[PDB]
Every structure is written in C-alpha cells, then in structure tokens.
Amino acid sequence: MRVTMSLEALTTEALAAIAAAQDLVALDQVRVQFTGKKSQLAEQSKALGKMDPEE
C-alpha cells in the first residue's frame, strides 16, 4: 500500500506491518517501503520542506 493520506493512519499501518514481520529479512522489507526508500515518509518530508517557511 501507499495511498494513506493521514499521518496517524500511516503509523498504525506501519506498526501493524512491523508486528506482522516474522523474519529479519522481512523486517527490512517492512522498513524499506516505510522509511526513506521512496516511501510515504520520504515524500511527506520532501513536500514539507518545499514551500513551508512557517508550515
């Protein structure tokens, strides 16, 4: 998934994907598509630092 337009809904989806990962290799798979590797946190961090002096 990727289309979750809510920060709180992103966390509970991330925490549920972490608790479901039953392998160490699958744990990095949860982390890759949820952190910096063009995930939803990376796109939100790039948009928040594009046109937001006070925002």
The DSSP code sequence of 2-54 is -----HHHHHHHHHHHHHH--SHHHHHHHHHTTTTSS-HHHHHHHHHTTS-S-
Would you state the structure tokens that stand for residue 33, as one six-digit string?
């598509």
Instruction: Decide: 8 and 15 in contact? Cβ < 8 Å.
Output: no
Please name the residues in contact with 14: beta carbons below 8 A apart, sequence gap of 6 or more: 30, 34
User: Collapsing DSSP states into helix, strand and coil, what is residue 1?
Assistant: coil
Instruction: Decide: 44 and 8 in contact? Cβ < 8 Å.
Output: no
Question: Could you tell me the resolution of this structure in angstroms?
Answer: 3.2
Residues 1 and 3: their CA atoms lie apart, in Å, by 6
Would you state the structure tokens that stand for residue 30, as one six-digit string?
């949860």
Residues 27 and 19: their CA atoms lie apart, in Å, by 9
Environment class of 53 (CB within 10 Å of its CB; exposed 0-12, middle 13-18, buried 19+): exposed
Method used to solve the structure: X-ray
